[PDB]
Amino acid sequence: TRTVSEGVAHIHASFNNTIVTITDRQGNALAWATSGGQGFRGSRKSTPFAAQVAAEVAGKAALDYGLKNLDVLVKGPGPGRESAVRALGAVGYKINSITDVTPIPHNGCRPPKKRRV
């Protein structure tokens, strides 16, 4: 429909669940997919096997716009952070850049206590 063809990627990676969203450079969302729609429904959502399928479903849903210009942003540690770009290359997207943009605070608020067990 739009076919500006410069949509960026936002691969949010967390220990519990991974989220990937496809939006343009300005930030207006285009299409997103998550492990929740996948159907593991539990701790298996964190597995890197679901992140790649979520990324590929997002890419197939986005190609209806005509996405081939990739700007990827990974935030937060945990498994499945690297599988998303792997699948997004497996489907065949051309790459503009890959870089790490996770925010680390400069002495932010007090963190929670340590879990003893």
Partner: peptide
């Protein structure tokens, strides 16, 4: 993210004592 208000001095002193040897 967690805090260790007492621990980092002990931790870094152990760090240096174990790195020197």
């Amino acid at each position: 993210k967690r805090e260790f208000y007492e621990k980092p001095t002990q931790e870094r002193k152990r760090k240096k004592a174990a790195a020197v040897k």
